Amino acid sequence: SYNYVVTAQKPTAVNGCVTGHFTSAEDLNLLIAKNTRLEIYVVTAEGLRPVKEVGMYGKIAVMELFRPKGESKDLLFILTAKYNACILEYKQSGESIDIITRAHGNVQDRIGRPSETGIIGIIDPECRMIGLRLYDGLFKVIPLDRDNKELKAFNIRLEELHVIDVKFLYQAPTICFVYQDPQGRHVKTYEVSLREKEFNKGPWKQENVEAEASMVIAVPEPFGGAIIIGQESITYHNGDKYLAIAPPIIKQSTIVCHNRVDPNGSRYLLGDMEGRLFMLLLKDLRVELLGETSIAECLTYLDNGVVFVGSRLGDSQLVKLNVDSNEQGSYVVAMETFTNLGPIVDMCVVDLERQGQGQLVTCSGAFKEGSLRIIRNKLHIRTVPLYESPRKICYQEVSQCFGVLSSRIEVQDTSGGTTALRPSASTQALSSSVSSSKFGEEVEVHNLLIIDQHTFEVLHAHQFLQNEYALSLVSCKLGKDPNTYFIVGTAMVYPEEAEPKQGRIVVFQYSDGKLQTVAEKEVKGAVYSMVEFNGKLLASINSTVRLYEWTTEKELRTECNHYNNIMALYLKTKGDFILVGDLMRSVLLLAYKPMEGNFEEIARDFNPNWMSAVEILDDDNFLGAENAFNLFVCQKDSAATTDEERQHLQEVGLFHLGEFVNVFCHGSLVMQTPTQGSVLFGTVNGMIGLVTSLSESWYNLLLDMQNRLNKVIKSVGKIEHSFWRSFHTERKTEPATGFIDGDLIESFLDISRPKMQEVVANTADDLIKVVEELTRIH
């Protein structure tokens, strides 16, 4: 137990961005939220000026600027995922910058169901109140006063239980929103009485709106009212006034972000799930297609035709609009590009160049933002665009290439068939091949790409069967065969069937630029995983764990089966040990009995929580990722005196990571010590972290050092470090065990020398040596 987890690459995905006057009443700022990270920029004529980067002990779930009466500059409100709320202020004196906490408190209710449309944080136009929709059926109101430094709040009962989107309107604080019910979807308004502590009748009647309304936009004065955006229509409701428009330009994809260009609300920026960028421009309403950006999580117009595009799925942009200059058309031009490794849905470590220092190659992003990334030690990233989604990646040293499964979307034809939406790596290979087979609706096409390790070109692309879904990829040698192979385990997926009744395990080989199907074995279910097991292939088909032998006939022969209680989503293996998993944390340990030719369950541990990945740390430890962004370690005791203890795995590590892991990976990025082992992981925000083991001595020492550091280090939002790292689900919250926050230990090198002395008060230079040694692990 007693492990050490440390960030190797901070989160790169952008889950929110705002513009305002935060560092000065005169500066124009761009505030970007990357999960636990808050980035502050000054908007210059040239570009963006980095000013201050803070870390928070929480997942920023809200981030909004507001300027109440009497304040010289904007203030920033933040609500973390664990419901820490706060108001922050920018103070600089000469060279010293500090983010001071003006008010803070936790707004969580002891009883409540999380809402379906998510948290929603909104602030009144007159800075009278902050509205939160955290739970279904309630509207929480925090009143904006100077004497509310604790951020106390009261709930108002909300009869409309399925609320989609809500904004404060531009005489009394009025909310306009959209609800869903058997009658349909409607738009309604309420005044909010701080004194009455309830809702009152809103300014204008409930109107019945489009059955796909998903977004509310509060138009400022002089227009006033609200804009409700759906899949087909964009309507404008201001009390009595109506102006509905149903442009065909938007019918192709749903609009998911908006931004007010002009302070009087004249023109708005619209962005859809597919990267299109629109302009919305009260007697008449109209739309204009400006161009193509990354898939936007958030848009923010800066000044002089420049816009910031934050991308959760892809890369973040600064783009220049040319809305004016009416000689040429409206066209988007990319000024700057900012690396976003997320989402990392798979990766591997390869010693490409130095033959001692490992390099990280990931599958990252989704849809047109799909790419590879090669990361090497300030990190260095090289982006191989794929214009489709990569799903698994493995390396094959013998053929000096990478095998990557991927998937692309094609639309059903009038002629009978499907047509791709754009060129993409599987359709622009130099060599292609298709498997032998036996309306406008999206269809998913899965391929095995073959990729040069040096150039990263798509040498070969093999397309799979219709409705075949590629699940598992392996590169390995089998049996007495000197050849190395790419093996893909698949699943047949039809919409009428609910569980996979057919699947394949396909043995390809890459020789002389030619990919050939060596062998194909059809199985009666989904091959969720495969692993090379001591010269045999261990394949999980639904709830079966099967072992295959590679005959001299170049065929896969079944040696044994083992039917489990659980579907074998996760497989891993160390030695003759096997770790079987499923989506619900159900852990299993098996051992192959070579003298009997069968498997023998060693231990298990069933604790229902959604599990995203598992990995074998040592013969005795297993590292996982589980619901609400946590990490855990389970342990085996083969020495125990009772057979009930020896078949039981004890929960020995609990840590609130703050990230959603998708893959664990044994390896290092440094030149190949108080640490033992190295597990690299990648997450949905693109974070890369490092997990390594300690000694009881080194654990206890750092543990004391954490508490001290917590007494000295000033948390933005005054969020406690123990609370943040505490293992979290909606049902239970337990303090973190067995894990050293290496991000907190390493922050010692950044604290002031007087503060360093305070911590070391049992020599501060003796501690700097320890921390610097610990920075040498990534």
Binding site: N15, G16, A61, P114, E116, T117, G118, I119, H162, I164, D165, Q180, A211, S214, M215, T254, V256, C257, E297, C298, R312, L313, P343, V345, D346, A366, F367, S389, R391, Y469, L471, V493, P495, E496, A498, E499, M567, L569, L583, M584, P608, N609, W610, S612, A613, N627, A628, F629, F660, N662, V663, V684, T729, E730, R731
Partner: protein, 372 residues
């Protein structure tokens, strides 16, 4: 079809209306408690289940009396072996209806209990009077948030709120749109979705009962999962396993697996003699196809209703007493090879009734089977 599904759940056959309580008792989750055990009860009581009872021995009558004055709750042990007197799990039963009667001079008490809370047996102790009290640990009920709510793009949170085959395809593509960020597909996240699992189970219940899904069936997965668990004609070693499950997602999932793998129901003593198949199962009671009933002398039978049985020989002639399904008669039915009792045949009494013949099979005499 032409007989009131409500008559069997009323348990009118027991007699006049009993005294009913409205209160409820629930020990806080995980709390150690000692609760007494009714000596002759052998059932493995699922929560949310009505257990009829008729108690005759004086030690039993005294024990119910104390309970009707205290928290009203007794412990029903799930036995690995009865003669072993060994149990690892069990369920709390709260008495919610009673009636005392002095018959032929001897005091008699009739009770309707309901299963409340799963527990783990910590210690069993038989006292100097012969009645045994149970050290027990109340096993909590596991509720999980949605699978991908964590990986939800806050901007993409809109997909979540959603508007039959075309509808479930849009439900899967919207509620599980954020599976694009994770390593597993959207359709695998639907293999762990309570509302998707339940809608698959409702498709099997409608095959058994013509009743509309909307009202009869509970919305809550925990209440839904336990209602289904109660009406599965499985064997006790399976039911003890099913009881051990804390997550509805897994309980609903092991329930669908049982309903699809096991299609044959064979005599438990022969293991190989086939009695009926899931195609014949049908609900003639509101509580479902299978309910719990009490015989005049106190024996309690979990009685699954089927239209057709085979390899059964009838013994005797129809009788109309204690007709758990009133308006019907019964003829004791034995297995043709081993002559063990399998259940009863119900034969109508007025020609207008439908079904005119049906069968009632006692769970403890069956064995669920996987063909081939």
């Amino acid at each position: 079809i032409n007989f009131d599904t409500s008559l069997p759940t009323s348990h009118t056959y027991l007699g006049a209306d009993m005294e009913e309580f409205h209160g409820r008792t629930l020990h806080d989750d995980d709390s150690c408690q000692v609760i007494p055990v009714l000596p002759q009860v052998m059932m493995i009581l699922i929560p949310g289940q009505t257990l009829p009872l008729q108690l005759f021995h004086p030690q039993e009558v005294s024990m119910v009396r104390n309970l009707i004055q205290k928290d009203r709750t007794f412990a029903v042990l799930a036995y690995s072996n009865v003669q072993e007197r060994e149990a690892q799990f069990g369920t709390t039963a709260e008495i919610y209806a009673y009636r005392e009667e002095q018959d032929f001079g001897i005091e008699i008490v009739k009770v309707k209990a309901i299963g409340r809370q799963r527990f783990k047996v910590l210690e069993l102790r038989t006292q100097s009077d012969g009645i045994q009290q149970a050290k027990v640990q109340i096993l909590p009920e596991c509720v999980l948030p949605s699978t991908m709510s964590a990986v939800q793009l806050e901007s993409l949170n809109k997909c979540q709120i959603f508007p039959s085959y075309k509808w479930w395809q849009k439900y899967q593509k919207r509620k599980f749109h954020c599976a694009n960020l994770t390593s597993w597909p959207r359709w695998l996240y639907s293999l762990y979705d309570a509302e998707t699992l339940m809608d698959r189970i409702k498709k099997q219940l409608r095959e058994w009962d013509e009743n509309l899904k909307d009202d009869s069936l509970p919305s809550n997965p925990i209440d839904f999962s336990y209602r289904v668990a109660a009406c599965l004609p499985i064997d006790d070693v399976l039911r003890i396993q099913l009881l051990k499950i804390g997550s509805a997602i897994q309980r609903l999932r092991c329930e669908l697996d049982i309903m699809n793998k096991c299609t044959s129901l064979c005599c438990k003593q022969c293991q190989e003699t086939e009695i009926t198949t899931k195609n014949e199962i049908f609900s003639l009671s509101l509580c479902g196809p299978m309910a719990a009933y009490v015989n005049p002398h106190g024996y309690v039978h979990e009685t699954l209703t089927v239209y057709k049985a085979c390899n059964l020989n009838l013994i005797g002639r129809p009788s109309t007493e204690h007709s758990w399904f009133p308006g019907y008669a019964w003829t004791v039915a034995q297995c043709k090879i081993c002559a063990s009792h399998i259940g009863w045949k119900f034969t109508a009494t007025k020609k207008d009734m439908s079904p005119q013949k049906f069968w009632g099979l006692t769970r403890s005499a069956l064995l669920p089977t996987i063909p081939d």
